[PDB]
Amino acid sequence: ATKSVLMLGSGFVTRPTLDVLTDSGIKVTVACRTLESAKKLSAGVQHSTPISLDVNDDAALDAEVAKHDLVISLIPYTFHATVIKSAIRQKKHVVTTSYVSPAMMELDQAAKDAGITVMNEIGLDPGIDHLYAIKTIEEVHAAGGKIKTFLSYCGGLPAPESSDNPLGYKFSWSSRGVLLALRNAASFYKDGKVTNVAGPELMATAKPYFIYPGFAFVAYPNRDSTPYKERYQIPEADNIVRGTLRYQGFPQFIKVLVDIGFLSDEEQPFLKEAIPWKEATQKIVKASSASEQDIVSTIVSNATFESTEEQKRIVAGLKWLGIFSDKKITPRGNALDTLCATLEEKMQFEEGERDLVMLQHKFEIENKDGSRETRTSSLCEYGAPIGSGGYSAMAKLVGVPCAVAVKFVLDGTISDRGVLAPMNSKINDPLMKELKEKYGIECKEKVVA
Amino acid sequence: ATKSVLMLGSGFVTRPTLDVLTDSGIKVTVACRTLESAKKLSAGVQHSTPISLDVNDDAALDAEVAKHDLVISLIPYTFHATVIKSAIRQKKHVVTTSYVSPAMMELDQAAKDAGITVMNEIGLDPGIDHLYAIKTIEEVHAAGGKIKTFLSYCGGLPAPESSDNPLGYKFSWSSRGVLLALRNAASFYKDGKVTNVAGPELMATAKPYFIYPGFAFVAYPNRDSTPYKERYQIPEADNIVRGTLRYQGFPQFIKVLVDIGFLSDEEQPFLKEAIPWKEATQKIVKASSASEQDIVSTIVSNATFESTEEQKRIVAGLKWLGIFSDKKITPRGNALDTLCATLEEKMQFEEGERDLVMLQHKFEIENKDGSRETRTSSLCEYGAPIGSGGYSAMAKLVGVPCAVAVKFVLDGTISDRGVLAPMNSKINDPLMKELKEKYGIECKEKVVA
């Protein structure tokens, strides 16, 4: 009479999802590579069963999956992910917050044959963003209007009062990919044409993006948004971009890091020994001395700055990280990874601080009668203060939608089998309704000249 | 030692002051221009007594003043001389949150002869700012250092999430003054000399002012900061500026109002009769057709825009205000006063919204050993949401410091007689200690060196 769920926990997002599931009368068994991790992550909630589990272990996982009705994976989905394949073998349902990839799509037919539902892209982004993007588009098309440009930007940042560090950004994991994904390429629709931008300019396109007077945001496009002309069914749109929001100064600092060779993951002989940052930076930057003046002069000769005041701030930001000091580096074989070890240590959310999620869609509309209007769909939320025991906005907006999904797959509200994403009113309406009415999670629409 | 206070109330900042004093066992008589408003403030507040009082009536005032130990004048700075003259005849203490004007200083001797303490400039700014400015200045001088430059900016604004209006600003009183600020002159110290900026070009001065990556602030100097070379006793400072903070876009919207004449003072006949905005604006902008198409193309022809993008945002803002609509106005004589009317109505804190106080001092220091460093002292606070029973940040930061000062003048912690201000450690240290330990109110210091 009671459905149980296997949750492949992953940091923050775990608590919220667990709380929603356990409160709906669902048995949840929180799995983490460490038992203590799962216990401290499942304390305070009824019907919770923590256990140790290695997901990288086929038999171990495959065996646990059969013990429950559905598998939730909050772990960033990789090409090497047994999770879904295992659910197919066990004829068990799945819910992930990951993007549907071609690799994942190949498993569609076998998932259907197995009669299981694999619901993905239902966190914050992808997730809540799809729901509201499609909602507006359907409303517009129904009124005979046209979506001329579709823009969508989302940022998981620290609240402004907690953004005081060089990147105006706080980390909770491997900045490994956070930084890596900063020099990637991007494709999107502009002026009705598939425009592309190579990494060597991505941060150069990261320009100020106005939303509210109080915030200082910048925006850059995602990997590729072109697929959305079809996925969101907007053939008439000349501009289509799904991107990311960061605070002012983020791009410029990252760009300087790139320009001086700090984002290179190219293994270095000297970066696998606890040497002084001072010496490591000298080598990475290729200066002639480990002197701060020599390092700075070298950095200035290989970087670009918009102003002297900013150059001073960026250089000050680097010094603050300690890369000009004698403090030993924590070895990681390459520049990128060695720097991340320090970034992660110097830029974590500290007790009492708050994160912030800012999501906003922008639609340039051409009405039936020929009128033009710009509509926005926004979601701005602060997380509970670190240490207060609440949820960070990020953990809430990813974990709740995901938990709702699980519930809808368990009670049949979502019955389409196979590999899904929230791309049609049949799946989306139930999701938006429950998120708005029961949890207050929603995007607010507004019109502009 | 049971005591009573006469509080000439004036609004929002009145509550925190009343709560604190009464929670401390002090009896407070709340006097307003109307017994009605007085009763609303004292409603349910223990030890509070509402009354109606005419401050402009020497006899009535002397009569009430005599019945208590100290009078708090929270009404406009204009009645302060009047209030202090009464306090001198009755030999009662006084406390205000206003700047010591010439008129108040002239009563310095008389106040001392009557044996009374007249404590002023003890709210947020003037107030908390003085305390932390002087605190750092004194610590530097004591260590042998020098204050090469002193910068201080303060802003009482809407929280970023609640800033989505044409000015990124919320009014709680007359809008006139906030709109004119950008047309006043300013005087300050820059590179060792008195520098004056005439009102005509104070506008071009409201440039972006970096504090934290998350915020988009602009700043402009106060009417005159030069006296602070003396008041803060920093003869060695080449740069001295005390100013105001607003959000991005505030200057640009004000400039368009200037360029089109909506800030005009000239008493026109058309604007004293309740006519539709459509006509009022075309009259003020001197446009042909009183329809958007023509009123808009006119404004665009007499105003400048930093970009077509900002142009669309500003025009939409003017439209959102309704100055292009059919609904009648609130005729107050001329454009400025008439426009203010609508701003009052359209831009105020509404349920769920919260304000923000951002205060930051910046010090460029030259230590005893010659090394140079930069130090900031910061206070960043959000008010309680409009709806809950909490105080806004402005109210708390103004009212609490005021109450602490009142208590101190009553129990003798502050015994200096005459017209005072928080200008030395004798007064400030106690104020600072109490505000920090009991209320958590303090500016956090940091070294951007």
Side-chain angles (χ1 to χ4, degrees), chain B residues 97-100 121-134 137 149-155 185-190 195 197 202 205 209 219-232 234 239-245 359-363 421-423:
Chain B
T97 58
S98 295
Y99 276 117
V100 173
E121 293 180 47
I122 182 50
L124 161 62
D125 170 15
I128 292 175
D129 76 313
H130 291 323
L131 309 173
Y132 283 84
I134 295 170
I137 292 176
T149 122
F150 166 73
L151 297 178
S152 194
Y153 295 96
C154 192
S187 181
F188 49 88
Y189 280 94
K190 182 178 185 174
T195 307
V197 51
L202 174 68
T205 222
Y209 188 72
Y220 61 91
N222 284 172
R223 5 193 60 195
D224 183 34
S225 310
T226 57
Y228 288 82
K229 174 185 277 192
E230 290 64 50
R231 291 193 88 183
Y232 287 169
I234 47 176
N239 303 299
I240 301 175
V241 186
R242 283 179 73 256
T244 303
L245 293 174
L359 166 66
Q360 185 194 258
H361 297 310
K362 189 191 233 69
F363 311 86
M423 296 307 259

Side-chain angles (χ1 to χ4, degrees), chain B residues 399-428:
Chain B
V400 177
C402 177
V404 171
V406 166
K407 299 173 73 177
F408 284 178
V409 174
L410 293 173
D411 77 355
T413 298
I414 296 184
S415 66
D416 295 296
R417 297 288 123 71
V419 170
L420 327 175
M423 296 307 259
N424 63 76
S425 69
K426 183 187 186 184
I427 295 181
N428 304 185

